[PDB]
Design a protein around this nucleic acid. Structure first.
Length: 902
DNA sequence: AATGACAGCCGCG
DNA sequence: GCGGCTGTCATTC
């Protein structure tokens, strides 16, 4: 087996590495790594090393990392560049694994854990770990077992042991409904006292020290807690045992509102699933509780237990422990689906970095380029420090608020990475600059052509066309790799077809599968064995095919991720290859591109429609343009179409056959104009929207930049059975909006786009007529309560007190002096309802804990005093008018016309 | 980032 | 008594 690393750390002058060896054993070693760095040297001094600028460098080998560091400070002092990889861990890795890392995840220990802490006085702060750890469930990937540690006695109660039998039973039979798939993988361990528990858990941790440490919120609660808990009860000494190198640091991070500390365990890679999810799920969620996310992903969350959590251990210790077991399992299921732990490993080993550095694009790319240049005996630039200066972004067309019956959109392919390749932008391919004309000038092609020797950008930058830069080369390398593994896609999948096709008539014999790699499309030169196959073959020849075929999907998706994160690093001052001029070159060029094609499209459609100066592109944005098909559908007449699907195809054909060509023609012109190194500006029809043929629907509308809704029928070739609404930017998409209301608003938008004015008006009247019968929770708006105290002045609203926070105050006053009432905690979200003047709460509104019913101590009055009128007006009506006004509809009959003036 | 609820502040017999 | 702004607090893209 080819050896691969697990974790690497630098402690002093030595590197500590944990790795899987030739025989698959987990080993660990200390290495007095001797790093090498480079300095510029005179021409005479012949060497094999050169910097990305072609200048000669001499390799300086140091006695130990300390010296290398000190040397860099010195050089820095004097003012001379110190070249080479300053992050020795990365160099050590690159040196020790001078090849393509092939890792066997089966040998990598991935732990998934969660603990429980009974705390009667509020959230158990991890920085203090005041209360005992009541329970711990720790799942190990190597053993595929859940190890449970149950504390049977604590100052908060003495409970009985947990029953695996009771746990497996059904809810109705008084069970916990712990899945049968894990019911056998549970190892229970009850403890008489906490000290015995923590001590045995620490031992357990030494026998099975995690390589990858995950869980949910584990790095901001579980680890810090267990760390400080053991620290206080035994001493920082024994607490350090949590780290395989007994070295730990307390990192303190200051966020949006405050600050929180987290523990760094040298020798372990912490991949908190909440961060994993947040970074790779690519989806904004109203809440990140494991409960919400699990429900969303797995369609099921966590045991609906009764009573508060603080008293759940005492009241029902049975449930309490099972609740902890299933909490761990859930994350494991979510990962079983999303596969983020594996995606991380895959990306880490490809870039040869610490697996946790997956969260940093800067670090990921820095390594990817370092290793690439090192193979060519080139030396990376010294990371320079730059001033965070803002810079020009993308261009967003100000759209004319209105309805748009027919719309067709086109997107540019990976604009930024493409622009970097087309123009050939890189820190070392900068040729020079040139007199810059106003951007509009270049968009209309009236400004003087920049140059005829160098590739240019509308911002004034010129790049060499001869040599390919370091950056564009790496992205292309990645771009290619993508289509390389996606070439292995239909080479193990699409090919796994001669297997399911030959599976209908399996010859009767006892033969084994044709043991040969599938990655490559099988041929009749060896795979000729089609019928000779039996039943245990064909059926086995589509496991491997599909087993690896998917493995490709991991590479393709990961390549997409680096490709999309590259611009990220590039426009970031801490990046080794950042350059304000290049960052601007990229965005400015894009600015031009989108508005250039906008011009071209408008010119084309106007000519082919025989009109003059008609604006066909109604809205542009970064890399998308939306065209109004109205004029096109009219050149035929809606009457000439059989049904809806009829004009959809018409448009699809028109776009592909007439527009696509016009567009590419236009961009080639632009590439020549800027004398770019390569034409890579590609645009594809994306969506086709409009109303059902013969309906009174308006098809779509725009409120303003980034705010629209379209009734789409075909998306990039894929035609939907039922039209899907594409809504970007409106209330219907904000969690702050009451559920029942996002519902109604969605229905409103729908009836507007597909049914028409009269329909909307009908639904409006009905919704408003049954508003008062809706459940008080579904009609309340939700908000995040930050800095509650900030505006608290004796339980009353201070100056400039936000409406929802002022609501919190009225609630605090309403329950002040009754510990049995749910507390509104800082940072958390709260439900908010208005209250009709003269209410016993003394204020205009009242808020309470989100996701929960309001305490019955005030429930009956809040229900009697809530202001339905105001509630409706502010949450429902106001936003609706925002849509209808734009689309020129009325959601109510008899509305004067002179409203839309002044 | 830009679009939007609330807050108080100015302005005009 | 309530349009015109600028200053918070929020939310999603």
């Amino acid at each position: 087996m080819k050896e691969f690393y697990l974790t690497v750390e630098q402690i002093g002058d030595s590197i500590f590495e944990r790795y899987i060896d030739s025989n698959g054993r987990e080993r660990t070693r200390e290495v007095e790594y001797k790093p090498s760095l480079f300095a510029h040297c005179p021409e005479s001094q012949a060497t094999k090393y050169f910097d990305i600028y072609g200048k000669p460098c001499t390799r300086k080998l140091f006695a130990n990392m300390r010296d290398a560091s000190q040397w860099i400070k010195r050089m820095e002092d004097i003012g001379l560049e110190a070249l080479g990889m300053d992050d020795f861990k990365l160099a050590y890795l690159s040196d020790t694994y001078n090849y393509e890392i092939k890792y066997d995840h089966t040998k990598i220990r991935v732990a998934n854990f969660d603990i429980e802490v009974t705390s009667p006085d509020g959230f158990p702060e991890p920085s203090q770990a005041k209360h005992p750890i009541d329970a711990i469930t720790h799942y190990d990937s190597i053993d595929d077992r859940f190890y449970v540690f149950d504390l049977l006695n604590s100052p908060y109660g003495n409970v009985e042991e947990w029953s695996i039998e009771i746990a497996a039973k059904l809810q109705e039979q008084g069970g916990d409904e712990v899945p049968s798939e894990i019911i056998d993988k549970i190892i229970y361990m009850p403890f008489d006292n906490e000290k015995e528990l923590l001590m045995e858990y620490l031992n357990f941790w030494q026998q099975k020290t995690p390589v990858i440490l995950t869980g949910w919120n584990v790095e901001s609660f579980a680890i810090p807690y267990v760390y400080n808990r053991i620290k206080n009860i035994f001493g920082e000494s024994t607490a350090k045992r949590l780290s395989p190198h007994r070295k730990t640091r307390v990192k303190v991070i200051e966020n949006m509102y405050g600050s929180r500390e987290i523990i760094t365990l040298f020798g372990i890679s912490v991949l908190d699933y909440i961060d994993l999810y947040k970074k790779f799920s690519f989806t904004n969620q109203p809440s990140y509780s494991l409960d919400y996310i699990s429900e969303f992903e797995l369609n099921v969350g966590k045991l609906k237990y009764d009573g508060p959590i603080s008293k759940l251990r005492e009241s029902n210790h049975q449930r309490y422990i099972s609740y902890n077991i299933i909490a761990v399992y859930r994350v494991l299921q979510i990962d079983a689906k999303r596969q983020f732990i594996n995606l991380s490993l895959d990306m880490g080993y490809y870039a040869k970095i610490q697996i946790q550095s997956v969260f940093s694009p800067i670090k990921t790319w820095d390594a990817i380029i370092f290793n690439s240049l090192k193979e060519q005996n080139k030396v990376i630039p010294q990371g320079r420090s730059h001033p965070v200066q803002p810079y020009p972004g993308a261009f967003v067309k100000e759209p004319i608020p209105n309805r748009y019956k027919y719309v067709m959109s086109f997107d540019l392919t990976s604009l930024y990475p493409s622009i970097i390749r087309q123009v050939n932008i890189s820190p070392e391919t900068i040729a020079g600059t040139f007199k810059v004309a106003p951007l509009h000038d270049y968009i209309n092609a009236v400004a003087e052509r920049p140059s005829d020797v160098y590739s240019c950008s509308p911002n004034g930058m010129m790049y060499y066309k001869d040599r390919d830069g370091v950056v564009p080369t790496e992205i292309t390398k990645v771009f290619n790799q993508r289509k390389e593994h996606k070439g292995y896609m239909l080479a193990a999948q699409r090919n796994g077809e001669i297997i399911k096709e030959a599976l209908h008539n399996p010859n009767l014999s006892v033969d084994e599968p044709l043991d040969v790699d599938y990655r490559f499309d099988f041929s009749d030169e060896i795979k000729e064995k089609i019928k000779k196959l039996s039943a245990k073959s064909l059926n086995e020849m589509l496991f491997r095919a599909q087993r690896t075929e998917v493995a490709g999907m991991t590479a393709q998706i990961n390549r997409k991720l680096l490709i999309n994160s590259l611009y990220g690093a590039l426009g970031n001052v801490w990046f080794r290859y950042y350059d304000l001029r290049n960052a601007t070159a990229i965005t400015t060029f894009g600015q031009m591109a989108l508005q250039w094609i906008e011009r071209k499209v408008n010119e084309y459609l106007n000519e082919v429609c025989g009109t003059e100066g008609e604006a066909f592109v109604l809205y542009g944005d970064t890399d998308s343009i939306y065209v109004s098909a109205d004029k096109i559908i009219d050149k035929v007449g809606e009457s000439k179409f059989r049904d809806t699907n009829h004009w959809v195809d018409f448009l699809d054909k028109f776009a592909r056959e007439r527009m696509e060509p016009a567009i590419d023609r236009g961009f080639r012109e632009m590439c020549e104009y800027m004398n770019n190194k390569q034409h890579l500006m590609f645009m594809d029809r994306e969506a086709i929207a409009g109303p059902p043929l013969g309906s009174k629907g308006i098809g779509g509308f725009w409120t303003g930049k980034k705010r629209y809704a379209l009734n789409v029928w075909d998306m990039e070739g894929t035609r939907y059975a039922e039209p899907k609404l594409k809504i970007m930017g409106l209330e219907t998409q904000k969690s702050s909006t009451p559920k029942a209301v996002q519902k109604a608003l969605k229905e409103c938008i729908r009836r507007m786009l597909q049914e028409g004015e009269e329909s909307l008006q009908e639904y409006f009247k009905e919704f408003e007529k049954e508003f008062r019968q809706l459940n008080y929770i579904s009609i309340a708006s939700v908000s995040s309560a930050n800095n509650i105290a900030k505006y608290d002045v004796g339980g009353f609203p201070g100056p400039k007190c936000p409406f929802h926070i002022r609501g919190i105050l009225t609630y605090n006053r309403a329950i002040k002096g009754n510990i049995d009432a749910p507390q509104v905690v800082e940072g958390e979200k709260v439900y908010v309802l208005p209250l009709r003047e003269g209410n016993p709460f003394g204020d205009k509104c009242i808020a309470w804990p989100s996701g929960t019913e309001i305490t019955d101590l005030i429930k009956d009055d809040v229900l009697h005093w809530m202001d339905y009128t105001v509630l409706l007006e502010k949450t429902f009506i106001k936003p609706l008018e925002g849509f209808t006004s734009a689309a020129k509809l009325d959601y109510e009959k008899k509305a004067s016309l002179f409203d839309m003036f002044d």
